[PDB]
Assembly symmetry: D3
Homo-oligomer: 146 residues x 6
């Protein structure tokens, strides 16, 4: 009964370049956890939330018709987005835009089997002015029971 | 095209297990950037801030007597801590505690040399109740010009 | 010189089903306090604020032309809406919508007659995804002197 | 149609005077849901959180050794406390104190059985200066899946 | 047209050097408004709030035994303090300290007499690390009806 | 090596009537600091941010093409706007609008020449309902190294 850093897995999927994330994809392949990865460019924060919801449903990480799944996920997304905005969640209303990669991981990270499933949402990318090149990095992670 | 993800380097230092970080430590040597790593266990947020300020100074990443350096670092730390707390920056006052790794990296990551120096502060850890095992992961990143 | 739970009156008007709130309507009828009740469905928070302002003016709880009345009320509304959003006041920008009942009560709740008038704004309903059934409950209360 | 307003039950327990709550206590018996009530006087927010965690555990509403239960409850408590503080969760640090009743209710309130269990935490009280009589009402509600 | 910028008067009292404020002190005499000034050094925010409450009472700007007066003043103080902290109201808990001047002015600044009395609270100072010289300026203003 | 209250200079430019700010304009003329003044009426906060950015670039206080300058300024603007909104930065989404004067000052306020440049953003005006006359005053100040 080993414990796993599910959040760090999600983050690595969001921040490692393609073909560097091989070992993560294999760990998740082994323990048979559901996950998805995606990208979103946004000036409205709801577009982030919807992108992640669209991806998680699409790759069967969560069931769009089951509120407990969607409630779990929604709260994780909002925690992740707070990491990126480092305060109030605003993009366009504060004249900034973000370009982000995301990952979502659903699994059983705890040693005790009774801890059940947990979900992780990671974000990594840039935030900046609406003009290319006037930006820096940002990150977030959200965790919730599911 | 010559730009570097300084934040991702800092986050990788904070999150990769000791002994997995060699290629990040090598890149930093080649560019001759200053950096440091550390760990802090805290039930009060000022202990995080003091720990990272203490580390950065003692490793000569910043000059503790120069306000522009300490001003730049302080704001980057608060940004990183927001990512960890996902809302109001509180630990003990909301009955939670954190165990965090951190890293600080300063160099010049943009192509244009006029962009000068920037500093990244990354936190990766757990947060939870003050009871062993009742915790989950958290992450944060702050960036500032310096 | 009895004291009255004006906030709890407002809340009961917002959360009790119709025909259950009889005794509240009679207490308010007795002490001759002004009040109003209403409903709003919204994806933009300003639509909540405007609905409540429209109702309070309409039922003569406040004077639309007197800023001290409208300043009193506005601040109470925003406190109530914070209860509902449990953090940043966002609906649509965070991909959620709310369906709420409200009540506003204006009166003299304190024992001392010199405490003058006070106003209460209560909200109760659901918040959720923009899709019906994927929602749970929410509440708020705001109090201010007037 | 079979759904229940679990939050409204919790709020009614918290706010109705002792002896007025019988029909709420009866509904809860018929559905066989777990629940508890309590009171806390506090000048620090962690005392609220500790009080409700202590109560829920000691009445077997949650399992203090199971993180998914304590994780679900903790987030519901912070949501309820936001409603009380109407902004930053502070008491003593902003020179205020609170006297609150609380209730926690867990059962399954949705029609579809797959929605499983949810927990409500409700706070109703006063908040004010640390001087007798310089206070007004406050309320909060938090809901989470569990 | 007869309106007065009561907040600007309060801010000018707080920020102008002693001996530069005479014309503001004169305007206040002519209108016979109540007011007070003061200084507070603090590492905890409640010390600000207590200091301004203490000053207002002891100079008879407000009646410490009347809740409507203390309620009006308290909210104006928290607003002013938000301007100083530029986010979460924290000093010591985020490893910073402040040295502030304040002023409180109450009179009736609107044209229409029905608008009655209003109170302004202004803070002007520095905030910084608890080390001499590692600081910069900050300001705040709060207004409320009273 | 004298120290200068650069923030208080910016604030005075934002709050003093025209022809009253003479001595400030002369001090800045003497030390040869860059600055600009402006006005903005807005119901969307990004319109404030853009107005100030447009003015600062236009009067050569900052270089629009240099991210370190624009990053410095952006953060100062957001600190200033927090002073005005006294919490969450919202105007129209919370059914309020603002009419503001601003000033931006860039200079070398510290005694030590190694402290380099710093920038100040001040705001002063009114915030209120979208209807004229139902408003009161607001202020903010942001400081950052540059
Ligand atoms: N630096 C901002 C983003 C930005 C807006 N404009 C320029 N940069 C941030 O930390 O989010
Ligand atoms: N889950 C909390 C931490 C915690 C407090 N108590 C139990 N857990 C968080 O997300 O920060
Ligand atoms: N559960 C969210 C609302 C929601 C959005 N999407 C799904 N649910 C809240 O607490 O406000
Ligand atoms: N009125 C404050 C409580 C308070 C503090 N001091 C006086 N009253 C609030 O709304 O939370
Ligand atoms: N610069 C901080 C104050 C500070 C803390 N440590 C150093 N400086 C602020 O803007 O509030
Ligand atoms: N009084 C509000 C502004 C307002 C909105 N509506 C009426 N007034 C504030 O402090 O920001
Ligand atoms: Mg929810
Ligand atoms: Mg600063
Ligand atoms: Mg605090
Ligand atoms: Mg504290
Ligand atoms: Mg106001
Ligand atoms: Mg918004
Ligand atoms: Mg918006
Ligand atoms: Mg959690
Ligand atoms: Mg109050
Ligand atoms: Mg930035």
């Amino acid at each position: 009964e080993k414990s796993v850093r599910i959040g760090r897995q999600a983050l690595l999927l969001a921040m490692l370049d393609e073909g560097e994330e091989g070992a993560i994809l294999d760990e998740l392949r082994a323990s048979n956890w559901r996950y998805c990865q995606g990208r979103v460019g946004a000036m409205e924060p709801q577009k982030i939330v919807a992108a992640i919801e669209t991806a998680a449903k699409r790759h069967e990480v969560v069931d769009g018709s089951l509120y407990r799944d969607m409630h779990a996920l929604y709260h994780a997304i909002l925690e992740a987005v707070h990491g990126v905005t480092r305060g109030q969640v605003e993009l366009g209303d504060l004249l900034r835009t973000a370009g982000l990669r995301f990952a979502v991981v659903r699994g059983t990270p705890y040693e005790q089997p009774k801890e059940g499933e947990w979900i992780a949402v990671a974000l990594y990318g840039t935030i900046g002015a609406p003009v290319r090149g006037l930006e820096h990095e940002a990150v977030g992670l959200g965790i919730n029971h599911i």
